Amino acid sequence: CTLKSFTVEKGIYQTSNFRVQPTESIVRFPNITNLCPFDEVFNATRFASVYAWNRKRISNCVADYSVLYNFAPFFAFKCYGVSPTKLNDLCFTNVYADSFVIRGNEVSQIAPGQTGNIADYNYKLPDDFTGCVIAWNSNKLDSKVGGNYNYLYRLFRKSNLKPFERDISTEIYQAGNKPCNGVAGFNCYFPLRSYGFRPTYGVGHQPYRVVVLSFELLHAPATVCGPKKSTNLVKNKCVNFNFNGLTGTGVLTESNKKFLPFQQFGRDIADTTDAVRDPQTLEILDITPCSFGGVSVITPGTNTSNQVAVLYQGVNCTEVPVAGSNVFQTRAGCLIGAEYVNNSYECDIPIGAGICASYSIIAY
Amino acid sequence: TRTQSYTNSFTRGVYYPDKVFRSSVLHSTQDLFLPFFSNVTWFHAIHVSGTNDNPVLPFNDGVYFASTEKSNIIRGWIFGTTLDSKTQSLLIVNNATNVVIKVCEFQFCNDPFLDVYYNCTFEYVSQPFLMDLFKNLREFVFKNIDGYFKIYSKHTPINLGRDLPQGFSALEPLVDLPIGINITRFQTLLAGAAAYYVGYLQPRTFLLKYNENGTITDAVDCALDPLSETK
Amino acid sequence: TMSLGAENSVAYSNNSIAIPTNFTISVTTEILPVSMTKTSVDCTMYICGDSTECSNLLLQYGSFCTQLKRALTGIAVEQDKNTQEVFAQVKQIYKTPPIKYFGGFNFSQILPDPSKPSKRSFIEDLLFNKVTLADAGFIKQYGDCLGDIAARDLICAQKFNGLTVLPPLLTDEMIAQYTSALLAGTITSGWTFGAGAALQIPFAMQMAYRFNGIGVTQNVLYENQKLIANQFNSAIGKIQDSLSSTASALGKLQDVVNHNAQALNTLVKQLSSKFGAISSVLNDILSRLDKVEAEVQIDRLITGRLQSLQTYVTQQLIRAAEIRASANLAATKMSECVLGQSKRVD
Amino acid sequence: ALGKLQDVVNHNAQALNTLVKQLSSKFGAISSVLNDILSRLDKVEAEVQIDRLITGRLQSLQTYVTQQLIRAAEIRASANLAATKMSECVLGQSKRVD
Amino acid sequence: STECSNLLLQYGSFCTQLKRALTGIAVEQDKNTQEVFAQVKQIYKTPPI
Amino acid sequence: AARDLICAQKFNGLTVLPPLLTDEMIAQYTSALLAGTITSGWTFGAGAA
Numbered sequence A: 001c002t003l004k005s006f007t008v009e010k011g012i013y014q015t016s017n018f019r020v021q022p023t024e025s026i027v028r029f030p031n032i033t034n035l036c037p038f039d040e041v042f043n044a045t046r047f048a049s050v051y052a053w054n055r056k057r058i059s060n061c062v063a064d065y066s067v068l069y070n071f072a073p074f075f076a077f078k079c080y081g082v083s084p085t086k087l088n089d090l091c092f093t094n095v096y097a098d099s100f101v102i103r104g105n106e107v108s109q110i111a112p113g114q115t116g117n118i119a120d121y122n123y124k125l126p127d128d129f130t131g132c133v134i135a136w137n138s139n140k141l142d143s144k145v146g147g148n149y150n151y152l153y154r155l156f157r158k159s160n161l162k163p164f165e166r167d168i169s170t171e172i173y174q175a176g177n178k179p180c181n182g183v184a185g186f187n188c189y190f191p192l193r194s195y196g197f198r199p200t201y202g203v204g205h206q207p208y209r210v211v212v213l214s215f216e217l218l219h220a221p222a223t224v225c226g227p228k229k230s231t232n233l234v235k236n237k238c239v240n241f242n243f244n245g246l247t248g249t250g251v252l253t254e255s256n257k258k259f260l261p262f263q264q265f266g267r268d269i270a271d272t273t274d275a276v277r278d279p280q281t282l283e284i285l286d287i288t289p290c291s292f293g294g295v296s297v298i299t300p301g302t303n304t305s306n307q308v309a310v311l312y313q314g315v316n317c318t319e320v321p322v323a324g325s326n327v328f329q330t331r332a333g334c335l336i337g338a339e340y341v342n343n344s345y346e347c348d349i350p351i352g353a354g355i356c357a358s359y360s361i362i363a364y
Numbered sequence B: 001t002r003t004q005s006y007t008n009s010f011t012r013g014v015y016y017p018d019k020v021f022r023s024s025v026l027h028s029t030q031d032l033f034l035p036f037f038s039n040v041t042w043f044h045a046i047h048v049s050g051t052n053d054n055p056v057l058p059f060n061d062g063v064y065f066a067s068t069e070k071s072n073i074i075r076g077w078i079f080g081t082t083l084d085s086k087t088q089s090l091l092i093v094n095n096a097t098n099v100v101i102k103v104c105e106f107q108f109c110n111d112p113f114l115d116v117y118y119n120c121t122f123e124y125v126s127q128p129f130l131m132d133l134f135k136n137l138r139e140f141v142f143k144n145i146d147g148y149f150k151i152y153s154k155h156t157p158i159n160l161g162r163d164l165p166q167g168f169s170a171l172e173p174l175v176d177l178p179i180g181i182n183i184t185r186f187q188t189l190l191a192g193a194a195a196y197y198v199g200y201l202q203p204r205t206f207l208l209k210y211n212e213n214g215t216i217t218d219a220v221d222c223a224l225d226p227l228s229e230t231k
Numbered sequence C: 001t002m003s004l005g006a007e008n009s010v011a012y013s014n015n016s017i018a019i020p021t022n023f024t025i026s027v028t029t030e031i032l033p034v035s036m037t038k039t040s041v042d043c044t045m046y047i048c049g050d051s052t053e054c055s056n057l058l059l060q061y062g063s064f065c066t067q068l069k070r071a072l073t074g075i076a077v078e079q080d081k082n083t084q085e086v087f088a089q090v091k092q093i094y095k096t097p098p099i100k101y102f103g104g105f106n107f108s109q110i111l112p113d114p115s116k117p118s119k120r121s122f123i124e125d126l127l128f129n130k131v132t133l134a135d136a137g138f139i140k141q142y143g144d145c146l147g148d149i150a151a152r153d154l155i156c157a158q159k160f161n162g163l164t165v166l167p168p169l170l171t172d173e174m175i176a177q178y179t180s181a182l183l184a185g186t187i188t189s190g191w192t193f194g195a196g197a198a199l200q201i202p203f204a205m206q207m208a209y210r211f212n213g214i215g216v217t218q219n220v221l222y223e224n225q226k227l228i229a230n231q232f233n234s235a236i237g238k239i240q241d242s243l244s245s246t247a248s249a250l251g252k253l254q255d256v257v258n259h260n261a262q263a264l265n266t267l268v269k270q271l272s273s274k275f276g277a278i279s280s281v282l283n284d285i286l287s288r289l290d291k292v293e294a295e296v297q298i299d300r301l302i303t304g305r306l307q308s309l310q311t312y313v314t315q316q317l318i319r320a321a322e323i324r325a326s327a328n329l330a331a332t333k334m335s336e337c338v339l340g341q342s343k344r345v346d
Numbered sequence D: 001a002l003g004k005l006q007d008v009v010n011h012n013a014q015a016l017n018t019l020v021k022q023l024s025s026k027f028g029a030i031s032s033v034l035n036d037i038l039s040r041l042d043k044v045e046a047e048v049q050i051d052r053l054i055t056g057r058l059q060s061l062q063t064y065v066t067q068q069l070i071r072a073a074e075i076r077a078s079a080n081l082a083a084t085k086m087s088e089c090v091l092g093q094s095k096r097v098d
Numbered sequence E: 001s002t003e004c005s006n007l008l009l010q011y012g013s014f015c016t017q018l019k020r021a022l023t024g025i026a027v028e029q030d031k032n033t034q035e036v037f038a039q040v041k042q043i044y045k046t047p048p049i
Numbered sequence F: 001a002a003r004d005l006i007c008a009q010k011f012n013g014l015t016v017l018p019p020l021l022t023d024e025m026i027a028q029y030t031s032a033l034l035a036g037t038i039t040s041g042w043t044f045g046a047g048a049a
């Protein structure tokens, strides 16, 4: 199948690559018990104004993200970095919820890389944002026939706004050469305008409620982790493992690595996680890959015989994962199916480091 | 009540850029670092008696603070832009068994001090960090990136007795705060014989050397000279 | 400004000649590379890190992942072909008689010492020690990489990504046996063992043959035999003193070892690049994003790692062509200078 | 008579002229001008077009470097032959035919 | 261009290995010239007649 | 008024390095080889002329 032919000539062929299959799966999560209060974020009486957008810190609880669809009818669920259906598998350190009310034609300003009025003066998102933006129409809750003036937004500011900064100052913006001295007038504007938010307005000018879930990636020990039960710890066996949302396959051993107390992961030259800290017992576990290697086939021509010797490259002959009669140990690895002989001939089929094979199949 | 001197910094102010263990590797990073052999400023604050001007300094993208005082004259810091009840003002106070961090808009006088035995969108009460009671040099790094206040700390005893000594000392990360404040000026707090060193961070690329035990024992500043650029 | 050399003027005249009245015997050292490291790359494991979702998308990228392995197999075959062509030029393994009086010439520093565990000469041991071998073959044997500090070694880090090193076909003991057979045949016969069957001849008459070849009558040898033998012994001692003192003579072999290590280190360190994706970890990408976005980022990483692998294979092919040219040159050197006397200048 | 040396000069000029003329290609982007892309598009779309241009120009540079490596190998072989001819014909007398 | 340079930094060590290959070629050209022409130890000069 | 191709190459980061051995020094090597060959034959290729 490798040579794509029905007739094989005499020689050694690099055919396969063997690998030890994983035995079982291990999940390891911190033993937190509380539930994250997303109901207080979403199901509220009223939301704060955008220039005073409200920030709530969510930590030390189990977060279920499939319950959010129940108590809020949203359609704008734009998630950057993390897919919203994968929020329950992996888990973060700390969550932040930024709640405000914005007009329907400005929801597109709540995105990384966007500038405008609100994205430059009221609420700015970083370009490396890892989070979700949730928006829903709230015309029936924020629309008054006499005009709702309880929602205010900044229109004038001397400079742009750095990401995740609140500016609730009320100083008069000076648009002229003369100083305002705290008195508004010509070229002296109050920088805090207010929306109308009438129910008779067309859609796109109707009020909308926005909750931005800002996620903090795994650098500290994790405090917010969703529903996934943690299994028992298995060492010295090739298993699949899950550590706070980090998935891998390998052998977990005890390590004498000296982690400083602020560290959680330990990395390699090729930017692969090879050392972990157990979130339930603070054990310094080392990750090695499972046993693998190359499989070469030493055969004569199929016109002569159909007998096959197998060379496992690199492994020791005690490392071969059986379930053999003739087993020989060469510097190239383990030779199975070829009987070693004490004689010496010319090299027919080369193997490596002075060992050759020839047609039973003998190795000399 | 204020005396300014200028001195060298040598190779000081190196901190861990992340919480990832690396052992026996040469890692290239780019962050707000204190440049090598920079010009740090020595401040002497002297009061007329041991009872019960404009010394406000600019922030300028991170501050490396250093102190060799045995007693706890230095108690905390004030960060902000205007600091006259017109905007948010970060206040860090170090108690004997507590640390308090606020962003309350209430202002103080032009000469702030902590008397003996003496709206707010963020509040942070925690275990304090000033246990370093040789000369017991204390180094701190404050920076503000993307609405996050990062405080790095280190406490190393020194024996040379000549200002900031030669050698390397990595600063471990201590405090991260999601306060989200504009900072351009800062000041210190006193309980007078205080003496402290101030340096300013710049965006620099460093090459850090992680040894067998995963400690940053050596570093190279890439923009110092062509030899280190070649390195 | 550099100096070209010391200025000289030949005292030319139409009736004046300069004739030498004495001589010296100069033994010089020339180093030629023959073979290099026989690397092998596990293509699928290097690209995907044993991931089924990555491998299914890797199956849509044709036969690059097999033709790179075919090219590396051809390079690994022609390395052993080069070594066989250079060294296996004698049909029978000759050996020196136990009496070692070759007309006063001392060959003890180049003939093998049986007291050593590997039958190599003193100069051969010096040349083996002066080159620091890195990635010599299958020395770890997949058993030295299961530690903690030993896992930090670069050979284990490149070993866990599917980048292995095949051992050479001829061991150093067999190469030393070839050089010992060639040396014993040359000393005991001259060029007759290269022309056909070995014909014995005393070394004094062999040196008389060589001087008559270069245009000097044999009575110069037969009246200056002790002086010529002392000059040859002093030159051999000077070579062994220079090889014991200066370690910078073997530049080409150390450059071959350094290039073969540096290519694998660069290929391993190319795994940390994002290549425009959100992360360089396929498990992190598959855990974070959905199926379609995971397919997009996995495809970006597959394209970047495939380009890096093709760059490595092209560089190895060019270096293999250069090594094969040097090995053909060295085989010509041995056939025309060890097995005979050369009239070609320099 | 000097067509070999003229071909060396012409190849070294042409391999740089092609590399200069390859900067006007779009490689599937909206434009081949980087400042035009940055002035027209916003961050994400501009990043997509800049990534396309980076991939195309990197592939062109790698092709140039590979061709220069092959040409350097050929010139090195010719220089080795010239050094052998200098050592044998000039510094001595050669019995080798032709 | 700062944005193009920041996007180019994610592509790895392609620039470093290309510059290394070109530097090796540039050294090899001078090595070829030296090994072709510098085959004499002393600069001889002809007699005036 | 007319832009040069070498200027267009140099404005896009492509540069040509000068050779280490200049043409006068190459001519000095060839002059030394010629004078040695004329005044000594092959004897300057094996030792002193």
Ligand SMILES: *[C@@H]1O[C@H](CO)[C@@H](O[C@@H]2O[C@H](CO)[C@@H](O)[C@H](O)[C@H]2NC(C)=O)[C@H](O)[C@H]1NC(C)=O
Pocket (backbone or CB within 6 Å): B006, B007, B008, B039
């Ligand atoms: C650090 O900076 C200060 C000022 O920024 C330097 O002090 C100056 O020193 C020069 C020469 O001694 C004087 O001419 C200036 O008048 C000083 N400036 C001030 C404001 O006093 C100081 O020299 C710098 N340190 C080093 C090591 O160069």
Ligand SMILES: *[C@@H]1O[C@H](CO)[C@@H](O[C@@H]2O[C@H](CO)[C@@H](O)[C@H](O)[C@H]2NC(C)=O)[C@H](O)[C@H]1NC(C)=O
Pocket (backbone or CB within 6 Å): A158, A159, A160, A161, A162, B081, B082, B182, B183, B184
């Ligand atoms: C943070 O506050 C500082 C004030 O300290 C602001 O800096 C001022 O910016 C205006 C216009 O950009 C200038 O006219 C002033 O001269 C600046 N003052 C100083 C002391 O530099 C700054 O714009 C604010 N915002 C940010 C994001 O830094």
Ligand SMILES: *[C@@H]1O[C@H](CO)[C@@H](O[C@@H]2O[C@H](CO)[C@@H](O)[C@H](O)[C@H]2NC(C)=O)[C@H](O)[C@H]1NC(C)=O
Pocket (backbone or CB within 6 Å): C021, C022, C023, C024, C227, C230, C231
């Ligand atoms: C030719 O040269 C050799 C050495 O190159 C000369 O041999 C040396 O002669 C001196 C004369 O006193 C001795 O002290 C040395 O011990 C000799 N050296 C060796 C290695 O034997 C030789 O004499 C020269 N012949 C002529 C005719 O000048």
Ligand SMILES: *[C@@H]1O[C@H](CO)[C@@H](O[C@@H]2O[C@H](CO)[C@@H](O)[C@H](O)[C@H]2NC(C)=O)[C@H](O)[C@H]1NC(C)=O
Pocket (backbone or CB within 6 Å): C106, C107, C108, C109
């Ligand atoms: C041939 O060379 C060997 C090695 O140089 C000579 O052996 C040395 O002899 C001296 C004189 O006694 C000793 O001091 C050294 O220790 C010996 N070295 C070794 C490696 O054995 C030997 O004498 C020379 N001559 C003959 C005839 O063999």
Ligand SMILES: *[C@@H]1O[C@H](CO)[C@@H](O)[C@H](O)[C@H]1NC(C)=O
Pocket (backbone or CB within 6 Å): A043, A070, A071, A072
């Ligand atoms: C919000 O909470 C109130 C009382 O806390 C409850 O009556 C109401 O049904 C909740 N809304 C939703 C959508 O669950």
Ligand SMILES: *[C@@H]1O[C@H](CO)[C@@H](O)[C@H](O)[C@H]1NC(C)=O
Pocket (backbone or CB within 6 Å): A031, A279, A280, A281, A282
């Ligand atoms: C819960 O976690 C803590 C800290 O990780 C640990 O000390 C404790 O043993 C855990 N409890 C159980 C039942 O595993």
Ligand SMILES: *[C@@H]1O[C@H](CO)[C@@H](O)[C@H](O)[C@H]1NC(C)=O
Pocket (backbone or CB within 6 Å): A316, A317, A318, A329, C141, C143
């Ligand atoms: C294989 O295993 C044995 C014992 O487990 C060990 O002594 C030996 O060094 C290993 N390696 C080889 C190449 O035999």
Ligand SMILES: *[C@@H]1O[C@H](CO)[C@@H](O)[C@H](O)[C@H]1NC(C)=O
Pocket (backbone or CB within 6 Å): B095, B096, B097, B098, B100
């Ligand atoms: C500070 O410490 C004193 C005594 O150590 C204590 O009485 C006081 O309550 C503390 N203050 C705070 C805010 O913790």
Ligand SMILES: *[C@@H]1O[C@H](CO)[C@@H](O)[C@H](O)[C@H]1NC(C)=O
Pocket (backbone or CB within 6 Å): B119
């Ligand atoms: C809180 O801040 C607001 C800002 O508008 C201010 O009006 C109010 O007086 C403050 N409350 C105090 C100082 O108690």
Ligand SMILES: *[C@@H]1O[C@H](CO)[C@@H](O)[C@H](O)[C@H]1NC(C)=O
Pocket (backbone or CB within 6 Å): B211, B212, B213
């Ligand atoms: C690492 O720590 C151990 C134990 O503290 C110590 O013996 C060893 O010397 C340390 N390594 C270095 C390089 O200092």
